[PDB]
Ligand SMILES: Nc1ncnc2c1ncn2[C@@H]1O[C@H](COP(=O)(O)OP(=O)(O)O)[C@@H](O)[C@H]1O
């Protein structure tokens with residue numbers, strides 16, 4: 003009929019009560035030494051299921067895991083973050099629901115120096131025997147008998163450079179006996195609560211989300227049928243390959259979820275730029291004038307860096323279905339992490355500054371002018387970019403706009419609740435673009451990740467549906483892409499034209515500095531010195547032969563599965579080469595290197611159980627083998643690796659392709675008889 007319940011469900015999704023969240027957290031014990039926030043039985047926790055039966059089912063599983071990760075956030079800040087303590091003078095209190103709101107005062111300089119805002123959780127402690135003689139730290143709070151968590155509710159600047167604070171605590175907490183009028187109470191920040199609150203909102207409002215069924219069942223919509231001519235038109239107009247054009251036309255033509263799988267270097271972000279232009283132009287091509295809200299598209303990614311990349315790439319405009327550029331109005335919601343004038347000029351705050359000028363350089367007017375400008379800028383916008391978390395910001399929630407279409411880049415690098423946040427504005431189409439063949443996003447709680455909390459929604463949906471695959475890679479030399487294609491993509495991942503020309507390098511003319519080589523080191527620990535020695539000797543040969551012609555600054559990375567090996571690798575490289583290699587070689591584990599790439603990569607394999615185990619090894623090998631563009635030198639002991647199918651496949655593939663070399667310390671030295679004798683007899 004007439005579904006005014008859309009407005010009612012919108013209202014529910016945007017006004018979830020946070021009090022139940024703080025009913026839990028404000029009864030936690032900051033001093034608790036545990037992986038878990040309380041002593042409830044471990045069986046209250048369970049794995050993220052592949053398939054959920056209802057919103058209540060989802061909430062039963064997911065809420066403990068969200069709170070577990072939040073607990074670990076408290077512990078990590080307590081045990082590492084060295085937040086700076088301060089003190090307050092207590093005033094009156096007011097009972098509200100299951101809470102006390104406690105009023106206090108503190109100097110503005112202290113609020114600034116200690117970085118306190120209305121988003122923060124703090125901890126209070128009673129430390130009557132403290133003397134200013136000593137420096138106070140969060141260790142003093144961790145060891146204190148009497149502590150109490152408090153949520154900063156309100157901060158109001160007063161006349162004398164002071165601030166009126168409202169702190170919220172739990173009614174039940176015995177610490178209120180210390181909060182007598184005019185008492186001095188010591189405090190330290192625990193953590194910012196914004197990210198948690200937004201995820202909790204999504205979790206608890208889930209039943210009202212338009213796409214709740216597809217979420218619970220992790221079931222994207224079925225493909226519809228699309229015109230071949232339309233795909234050809236998009237291919238030509240957007241300068242895309244076939245797989246990219248198919249992914250755009252199919253995913254925009256249907257409602258609900260679509261998954262676009264992009265291996266390394268296959269144009270995930272480029273395809274999103276095509277989605278934006280194609281969506282906006284086909285939507286713009288659908289007795290007094292009616293007033294309509296302007297269609298928008300909401301574009302998100304997990305991190306500030308990924309959002310800024312999209313923003314930067316949109317500044318060259320987007321294109322309509324006929325290939326003509328147009329310049330839609332773009333707003334970046336949320337300040338970025340980095341400083342970039344290109345990104346700054348797109349942020350809502352700067353667009354407001356430019357819209358209102360120096361008129362208010364009187365405070366009533368300044369705030370009003372800013373709010374009117376904000377409303378105008380958002381109303382006339384075509385594209386809103388934000389992080390997933392930032393999509394929940396007040397500035398979007400107060401626009402009165404349905405974002406029926408949401409696009410998510412880097413969609414495998416977020417927890418599930420995070421990917422759902424932007425769907426709260428009536429999301430009926432969600433196109434998620436990601437690479438599932440990488441390590442899952444890092445979470446602080448190992449216990450939570452053992453329950454699969456570290457799994458994206460994309461990955462859960464991939465179990466039930468085949469994504470649109472982007473099948474041409476534009477980064478790696480063909481000798482480097484060959485085995486990843488055959489081993490992980492059925493040989494169907496192609497190279498862009500001229501990958502051999504683009505990635506040809508001068509050292510490729512000197513064996514064994516080839517584009518692709520497995521070095522079988524002829525020689526239950528997690529380190530191997532002989533692999534380090536061979537890595538050093540390869541890089542030394544490279545440098546001796548080429549560093550009077552080529553600047554190796556930023557060109558090399560050395561990775562391994564194991565941190566023990568990389569500690570030893572860095573130590574030996576530092577001893578042998580001294581400070582001269584700092585700017586040339588980055589050292590990390592495979593896991594730590596996931597978002598990085600280099601012209602030259604050396605892998606120290608060291609050595610090679612379950613399905614969870616095989617999955618982590620599959621992801622690590624996908625990552626390791628795609629980090630290099632021009633040269634990848636894989637160092638290992640064949641017998642110590644061949645118990646893994648992945649490594650045995652890699653080694654036998656390399657033999658088949660004549661890309662296996664025998665190595666040992668001294669093998670590049672013709673005068674080293676001891677080494678040439680080891681080699682010769684082989
Ligand atoms: N269809 C294409 N034709 C030519 N180059 C392409 C194509 N698609 C992607 N590329 C190139 O691939 C590289 C990575 O593109 P990008 O959109 O950053 O991919 P990803 O987001 O998947 O890392 C860029 O150099 C881009 O120009």
Ligand SMILES: [Mg+2]
Pocket residue numbers: 270271272
């Ligand atoms: Mg990208």
